[PDB]
Amino acid sequence: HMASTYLSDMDWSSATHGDIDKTKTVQKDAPFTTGNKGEHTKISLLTSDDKVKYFDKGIGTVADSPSVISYDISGQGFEKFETYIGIDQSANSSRSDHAVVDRIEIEIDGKVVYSSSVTNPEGFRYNTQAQFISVTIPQNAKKISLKSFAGEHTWGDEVVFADAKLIKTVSTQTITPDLLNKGINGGVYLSDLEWVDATHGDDDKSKTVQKDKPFTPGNNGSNNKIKLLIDGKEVEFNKGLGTVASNPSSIKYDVSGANVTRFISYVGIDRSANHLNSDYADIQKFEVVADGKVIYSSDSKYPKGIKYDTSAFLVDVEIPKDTQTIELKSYSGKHTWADELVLGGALFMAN
Numbered sequence: 001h002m003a004s005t006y007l008s009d010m011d012w013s014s015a016t017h018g019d020i021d022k023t024k025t026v027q028k029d030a031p032f033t034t035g036n037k038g039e040h041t042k043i044s045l046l047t048s049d050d051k052v053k054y055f056d057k058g059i060g061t062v063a064d065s066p067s068v069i070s071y072d073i074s075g076q077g078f079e080k081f082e083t084y085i086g087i088d089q090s091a092n093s094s095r096s097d098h099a100v101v102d103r104i105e106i107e108i109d110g111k112v113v114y115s116s117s118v119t120n121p122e123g124f125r126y127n128t129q130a131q132f133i134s135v136t137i138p139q140n141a142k143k144i145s146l147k148s149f150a151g152e153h154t155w156g157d158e159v160v161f162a163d164a165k166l167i168k169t170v171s172t173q174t175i176t177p178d179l180l181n182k183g184i185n186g187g188v189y190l191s192d193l194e195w196v197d198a199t200h201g202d203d204d205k206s207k208t209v210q211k212d213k214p215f216t217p218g219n220n221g222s223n224n225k226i227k228l229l230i231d232g233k234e235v236e237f238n239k240g241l242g243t244v245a246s247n248p249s250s251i252k253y254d255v256s257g258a259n260v261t262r263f264i265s266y267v268g269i270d271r272s273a274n275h276l277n278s279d280y281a282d283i284q285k286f287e288v289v290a291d292g293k294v295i296y297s298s299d300s301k302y303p304k305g306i307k308y309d310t311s312a313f314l315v316d317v318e319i320p321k322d323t324q325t326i327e328l329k330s331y332s333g334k335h336t337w338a339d340e341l342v343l344g345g346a347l348f349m350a351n
Ligand SMILES: CC(=O)N[C@@H]1[C@@H](O)[C@H](O[C@@H]2O[C@H](CO)[C@H](O)[C@H](O[C@H]3O[C@H](CO)[C@H](O)[C@H](O)[C@H]3O)[C@H]2O[C@@H]2O[C@@H](C)[C@@H](O)[C@@H](O)[C@@H]2O)[C@@H](CO)O[C@H]1O
Pocket: 018, 019, 020, 021, 033, 062, 092, 154, 155, 156, 157, 158
């Protein structure tokens, strides 16, 4: 059960670079120069056999004596640090005195735990192929430092720590939209299951509750994914359910032949749904019901209901065992016509 956190999705406690222009800063998820210029170029290194590889995540800097990027990792339980290292393909390397990096170092708590000295005794040039390194982290480590040594000049020393991440072994994962998009071990998506039956609050009964799509767009033949507001940002979902709330509407699952321990989903209104400004909620509440018994209700934490501009909230409820039947109940706001709900990434943990 491996958990990862990219360094570019964190905050450094300190960061230095070897560019004279101190208004420029260390670039997250981009090369140093192109990033500071506002260009959209991504991090690119050389894998085996002069093969160019592009990366979404990483850190981009200019080496100094040394350039140092430090992260505070006190009591976070990390075990491994892993990254590609090398000079970016975008580096200004027409001059031989450009893109010449002496050394790359990983330091943990004042101790150098990795040095590129062994693999690269002549350091890195513009054409040197990337090194993928895995650096062990001691039990109670506090501070990790990425260090790049420029040598005689900093020119073209566009050092990238491509795909840089910190790794640990956790018991249970922490639920995020990306985790539900990537998958979870033992998590079965409801949209990959058959319900006993389902009802909705739309008059057109030729329409049906939708799998991996919002209700109306799904019923019209659109293949667009579910999209929700998560902490102010619009976030797509690969899996989920699209339905219309009623008095309530319901979707029924038979779990009498299984050992389901958990129901997990984000719940909100799809970004493509019709809405109107109102003091009143679009959806009054959403309930999870285990054998006629309500085990979760959204009004326990959202008593006013949910509007279009409400951030999708996370439902993560324990399922009592020997549960035969699970019911998902969607309740109309009653004052508007907007009744369309989506369950983003909806899944059962079978354990
Ligand atoms: C007119 C004039 O002479 N202007 C000076 C300018 O030449 C000089 O710019 C730097 O020139 C050196 C060679 O002498 C290098 O080519 C620098 O570029 C390279 O190195 C940096 C990091 O050290 C970075 O990796 C660049 O991408 C890489 O191309 C030049 O510096 C770069 O350009 C200038 C214009 C600024 O934007 C810098 O912030 C940038 O790093 C500078 C520095 O001596 O002084 C000018 O007066």
